[PDB]
């Protein structure tokens with residue numbers, strides 16, 4: 001029994017001493033003459049050259065430097081089996097390296113200051129504006145690139161402490177409180193925050209400035 | 215040509231819906247009769263049960279729920295292939311699952327307050343105490359569990375502002391400037407910090423209280 005495909009999943013930004021062994025190539029034809037293992041492909045001989053390499057006599061595939069998924073997320077290499085005569089013995093094996101994602105990028109708002117406005121008399125619940133942060137890490141298979149929005153603070157605290165809220169996933173800011181009035185407070189400064197790992201990771205900060213209209 | 219062993223490396227705390235395909239089993243004798251696949255082992259048919267499954271007809275190994283490395287870091291399963299007639303066609307194949315680490319643990323100081331003392335006349339460079347934070351994530355293959363130490367602030371600022379240093383990786387607090395004096399300042403309060411991903415991650419905060427002795 002075997003796998004139809006056996007890719008190698010390697011987490012990026014690996015820590016330990018390099019090189020590192022991943023898996024070990026074997027030719028079943030090795031019960032005859034001593035065979036020599038090599039490797040080809042981008043990441044091996046095509047650029048980026050030398051990221052992976054194979055020990056000639058042992059077949060151990062080696063990773064030489066830490067990977068960065070956001071630079072290259074998958075490799076397609078080829079293992080080669082030859083004899084002393086430098087003659088290959090069986091077709092080259094496909095090698096698929098999948099770089100799995102770590103949380104090595106912090107979220108980043110698209111702007112330092114977002115600007116919106118709303119009419120003083122809108123109903124609680126009315127949307128005002130939408131803010132956006134991005135995260136270089138994966139958000140499809142992991143949480144590393146999943147941003148959660150929040151409002152840090154509101155200035156001025158007049159009338160209520162908290163006039164606005166934000167949708168934690170979409171970044172839409174809405175009115176949650178009655179009492180907006182341009183003549184009393186014409187503008188609010190909301191310190192907004194975006195945290196990766198869906199709220200458990202790192203945070204950056206920005207500002208949403210909301211103008212209150214008559 | 216093939217891999218000597220082919221472990222499946224699965225990042226913990228995965229997102230998206232479940233179940234998810236990992237690798238697909240295949241029996242060599244696949245034209246002899248219809249093959250029905252199954253898996254056994256802890257994580258499959260013994261506790262924790264049902265973490266893994268195989269599609270009886272297709273051989274797809276499935277992950278049924280998110281893994282937590284800090285709960286179980288490796289699994290050893292077995293794949294079985296039996297014909298429609300009820301014959302086991304090959305030896306059960308060993309299935310090795312490696313749970314790779316994500317950064318799902320902030321570092322935690324061993325105590326909320328660390329207390330140490332030093333004599334007033336020590337030479338700069340003299341060690342005062344060692345504070346400690348732990349991080350449940352892996353620190354051998356990743357940086358997710360590697361803690362970096364820092365001193366946030368010192369009170370009272372009294373003689374200098376930088377009376378002490380903390381060793382970024384050992385957590386040893388040293389005195390760095392001569393000029394201590396129990397009579398002028400008998401007790402400093404250091405606000406200490408510990409940050410995972412070797413300083414690029416999340417930070418906890420604790421306190422160190424250094425008493426100055428006669």
Ligand SMILES: Cc1[nH]c2ccc(Cl)cc2c1CCN
Pocket residue numbers: 069098099100101102138141142225226227228229
């Ligand atoms: C970071 C990352 N990138 C992928 C791309 C393809 C596949 Cl199979 C898995 C992954 C993962 C980890 C899944 N939690």
Ligand SMILES: Cc1[nH]c2ccc(Cl)cc2c1CCN
Pocket residue numbers: 201202203204320415416417418419
């Ligand atoms: C846990 C954690 N993670 C962060 C990510 C970014 C920033 Cl600025 C701060 C933090 C903190 C708390 C700092 N006391």
Ligand SMILES: Cc1[nH]c2ccc(Cl)cc2c1CCN
Pocket residue numbers: 010011014020021022312313314315355356
């Ligand atoms: C990231 C990671 N985590 C591990 C845990 C156990 C073992 Cl065997 C290997 C690993 C690796 C891959 C090293 N290229």
Ligand SMILES: [Ca+2]
Pocket residue numbers: 066067068071072
């Ligand atoms: Ca790279």
Ligand SMILES: [Ca+2]
Pocket residue numbers: 103104105106107135136137144145146196197201
């Ligand atoms: Ca991130």
Ligand SMILES: [Ca+2]
Pocket residue numbers: 012069070101102103104105136137138144
């Ligand atoms: Ca990443």
Ligand SMILES: [Ca+2]
Pocket residue numbers: 262280281282285286
């Ligand atoms: Ca589990």
Ligand SMILES: [Ca+2]
Pocket residue numbers: 317318319320321349350351358359410411
């Ligand atoms: Ca951690």
Ligand SMILES: [Ca+2]
Pocket residue numbers: 226283284315316317318319350351352358
């Ligand atoms: Ca972890």
